[PDB]
């Protein structure tokens, strides 16, 4: 149980570091909208190729 | 008290000394490193409150999946026919859903 | 009489373990809330120092 | 009686001294060893009543 | 009575070996998840340094 | 009693000291030698009950 608490707190620190990295992009509109436009236009291009096929 | 006059003259001396030194480029480079150190320490404090948010959210997920495993244990007790184990599994669900609601209230 | 006492002690232990483990997990949670409150106090104190230096 | 005022001031002094000391991590580590010592002694008492049952 | 105890001890050993070996393999797995989380923290920290230097 | 506050601060000091030390590799190597020493002593106890059976 004691060594499992040390493993648990280490993985909780990874989840807090992951949340802090996600917050560095939260409300950062330029990178956030760039990633959204890249994903949206990639799906629309794949569907345009599927409609052409 | 007597120390007061020594305070006035040392305050005048250090103001003369700094005033003789001060320049636009030095205050600009100091002001950007000051705001960088303030910003990185304050973002580390936000990373601690985010870590407590994700800690309490993963605790809520662990209790809510454990509560469904006590419903699985209650179903298994009912197919075994063991009423005392089915009733204990209901009491486990009732208490563990109360701790889940406590974690959900803290997370809110 | 010893087995009815033995079950009564088992109930006393089960209730005690439940309330101790609840109190300890809630104490860890409120200490994490107090750590977040301390971080907000540091944020306001450094914002005051940014104010006077600016 | 006269001892009463000496009791009030020593109670205030020891409260100031402990208050100056107290921190979240120290009370958490104390609280887990306190419950471990209570639990192991109480389980030994249950082992005595189980031994009388058997 | 000794052979029924001997089988009962064999069951206790088999259950103990199963839960120990499960706990040790799960501890290695969660340490590998924590190593991946540390690598994502280094990635975000170096991306911050790429940001300020750029 | 007065010893209580000295217990809280020494418990906080030893928790700070161990927390500063702790790492994933050290706890993994300790956990495998801990289970090896537990397993070999418990198998020696089983060898004593087997010797009484034979």
Residue numbers in the entry:
A (entry chain 0): 164 to 216
B (entry chain 0): 2 to 109
C (entry chain 0), E (entry chain 0): 110 to 163
D (entry chain 0), F (entry chain 0): 2 to 55
Please give sentences taken from the publication describing this entry.
Using single-particle-based helical reconstruction, we resolved the structures of type I tubes at 5.1-Å resolution and two structures of type II tubes at 7.0-Å and 7.1-Å resolution. The type I and II tubes differ in their diameter and the arrangement of the monomers relative to the tube axis, as well as the diameter and thickness of the engulfed lipid bilayer tube. In contrast to the Vipp1 rings, the monomer orientation of the α1−α3 hairpin with respect to the tube axis is the same over the whole length of the tubes. Nevertheless, the monomer orientation among the tubes differs; in type I tubes, the α1−α3 hairpins are oriented parallel to the tube axis, while, in type II tubes, the hairpins are tilted approximately 45° relative to the tube axis. Remarkably, from rings over type II tubes to type I tubes, the α1−α3 hairpins accommodate a wide range of orientations along the tubulated membrane axis from perpendicular to parallel (from 90° to 0°) while essentially maintaining the same intermolecular contacts to stabilize the assembly. The here-determined structures of Vipp1 polymers in the presence of membranes indicated that helix α0 is immersed in the outer lipid leaflet of the bilayer. However, in contrast to SynPspA helix α0 that protrudes toward the bilayer, Vipp1 α0 lies flat in the membrane plane and appears to be partially submerged into the outer bilayer leaflet. The bilayer thickness in all three Vipp1 tubes remained nearly identical at 35 Å, although the inner leaflet radius changed with the tube diameter. Nevertheless, the same or similar intermolecular interactions of α0 with another α0 and α1 + α4, as observed previously in Vipp1 rings, are present in type I and II tubes.
A prominent member of the PspA family is the vesicle-inducing protein in plastids 1 (Vipp1), also known as IM30 (inner membrane-associated protein of 30 kDa). Vesicle-inducing protein in plastids 1 (Vipp1) is critical for thylakoid membrane biogenesis and maintenance. Vipp1 appears to have two functions: in membrane maintenance (that is, during heat or light stress) and in thylakoid membrane (TM) biogenesis and/or remodeling. Vipp1 binds to negatively charged membranes and membrane binding depends on stored curvature elastic stress.
